Design a protein around this nucleic acid. Sequence first.
RNA 1: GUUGAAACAGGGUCAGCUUGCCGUAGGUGGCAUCGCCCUCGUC
DNA 2: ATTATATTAATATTATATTTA
Lengths: 124, 116, 124, 124, 283
Amino acid sequence: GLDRNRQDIGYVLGRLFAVLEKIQAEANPGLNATIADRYFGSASSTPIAVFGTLMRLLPHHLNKLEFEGRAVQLQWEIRQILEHCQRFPNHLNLEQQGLFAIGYYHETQFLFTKDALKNLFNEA
Amino acid sequence: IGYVLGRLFAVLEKIQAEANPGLNATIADRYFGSASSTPIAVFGTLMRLLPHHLNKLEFEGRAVQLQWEIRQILEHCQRFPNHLNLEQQGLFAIGYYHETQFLFTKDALKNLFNEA
Amino acid sequence: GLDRNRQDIGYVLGRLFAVLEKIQAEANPGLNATIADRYFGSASSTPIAVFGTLMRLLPHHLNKLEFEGRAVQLQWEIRQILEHCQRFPNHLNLEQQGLFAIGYYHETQFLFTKDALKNLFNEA
Amino acid sequence: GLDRNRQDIGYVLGRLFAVLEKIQAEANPGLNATIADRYFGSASSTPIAVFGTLMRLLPHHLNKLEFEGRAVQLQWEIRQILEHCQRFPNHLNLEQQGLFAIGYYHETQFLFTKDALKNLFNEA
Amino acid sequence: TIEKRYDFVFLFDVQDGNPNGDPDAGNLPRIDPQTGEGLVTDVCLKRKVRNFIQMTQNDEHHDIFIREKGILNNLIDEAHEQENVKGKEKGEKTEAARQYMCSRYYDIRTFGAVMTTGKNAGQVRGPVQLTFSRSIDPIMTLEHSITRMAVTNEKDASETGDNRTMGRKFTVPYGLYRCHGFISTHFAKQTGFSENDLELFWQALVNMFDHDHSAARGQMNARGLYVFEHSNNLGDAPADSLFKRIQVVKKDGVEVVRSFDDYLVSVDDKNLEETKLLRKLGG
RNA sequence: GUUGAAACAGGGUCAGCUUGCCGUAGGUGGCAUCGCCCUCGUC
DNA sequence: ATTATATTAATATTATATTTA
């Protein structure tokens, strides 16, 4: 249940936030306050203010991972998502506001799986 | 497009109730007026309030199970519609009651989460 | 999924940082802390302070590569990106702050490919 | 993508370093460590210390070229760049620090072309 | 009770720090997404005024609304057990309790508070109602990420070596937040907002950026405060043009702004001399 | 051609006359990019 | 005319010379 060729800005924005949250959760299991507990409150409205710090903290989160190939796969899927994201908009429309959370939870479901992300990464 | 939205509202209210036991003005009593009609307006802020409710949960595994089940719910919804038609609001109510009674069952959500 | 004729400052800045990170990663596979783990934290806000040391370390990173033609291709794409970069600004706007990461991940995806960068270099 | 009438000190300084590196590369294709692998590390900060030895080594690099007209064209574009360079400063500002690399890569892109430098030299 | 209308043009900036952070965005100040102008909520100024009153009063009949150790239900129950315990027939009892709290509390008298919890006692409309601030020049976010050489919790993130917990501490270089606000008289006559309370509120708005300071907010100061004192309780001219007369734009050929030497506060009090006044307290 | 035939749902009716989402509230207590490194061996 | 309340998943994308009267 995930459309990677929707060419929607909200879809790819939500998928990017979802993989960012997944990376932060994988960086440390004993995490109290994640990014979703603070960054998601304005991610669908002011993405250019939160996604900047998100991309700034992404490499450190990837380096914090115990496995280096996992970070490679996560960056690969990040870029496969952002392929359709030609630019970070100022503010999302209501339809895009909903598509944000849609793609967010869709990408979260696609990531929290047994054999799916690695299977898609193998065909690249 | 309406049934899964009702299940979404139901699990949102369940997470909010598990966060605050003595709830007075729940997210339901303030958002269900338009959640049944305009989804992109209510769910555009309920999905924002949800991670804070999940972090408020004293049991992190419960929040994990609720996040997994809301992922499984929203997977069937490809996009939040502009407005729910008259039958879509009925589907919303039906899914709301179905999910709010499936979550208040003995060992249903845990058994569903363990099978993933 | 990459616009090379967008004429946006954030786009070309992000693409330049992306190719810099790619060059640093290609210089040594056993790299622990890359530039993205330190330089990206202020690359979209204070580019004139990080991109100076970036351009200073770029020739040594290119010389560290085992293949000399790879460094030539990387410099060629660096200059093709910086064509639209008429000047390094002091601070990027919010839209430019988002376009920074947009172009960064777009160029990273375009670089981590089979036949794409070399194909574009052949038509020059 | 090159502004020759910007009247910026960093722009012309970077263009001068770029044409110097181009001349050193054209002097011998089998070059291991160029000037950019050592001189560029302090070219935008202490230009009066590196550009002196650069101008000292420039005539020998021009004489090392197999074609004498190429050296003439390179000196012509060097002087066309340095026209706006009224003096070599002690230290460049942050904006000038970025403009250094900007002009450097812009001039490198303008030089590594088919018909461009010779076309500009013909109209002189 | 006051009888004049006041349209103050509060102007305040920030040297280096995070003023009004977070519309749920981590730790960044509220900025305009489409443009880049910084925004500051009025609750920050209200809390600064409350802190100034708490540190420059310490007396009765001017309650300051206590901090963390202050349950609103407990305060409401304490204020209920006074003159109208039960012998007042619920309806007017709520109004009597509201009037008593207005005569006793200063925060509810100047602004307002929620008194509709368990023992309901009505609600206060509030006379003075500030607005959200907004700068003119598109400010930029610096994001000054700093570190710490001491871990907090004993989780798995605490390595055997350098127990470090970095994070980010956002900062702002400049941004004159052109604040706005209007003061009414009908609600002030009911809440008991006298002229002494108005002068105290003006003094607080003027001298709140000198005591209420922290490490995250850094150094903040108030530029000017041009109060538009009216003559009656009616409406002479729309407040839009009134607040537009004091425009704040860029100076000469400059890209951004760093201090007061880069702004040109154009103050041309020419058409506002009909039935209105003008005073300068901060500038 | 001598055997159930004929059949109105109607003429036709403003669902309103209307009602402030609010009264309103600090992302916070604050945290060293660090403990460190010959540009060299030298023609 | 309530219910319920404990953790999904994680191991490497890529990588071979523009231009020089």
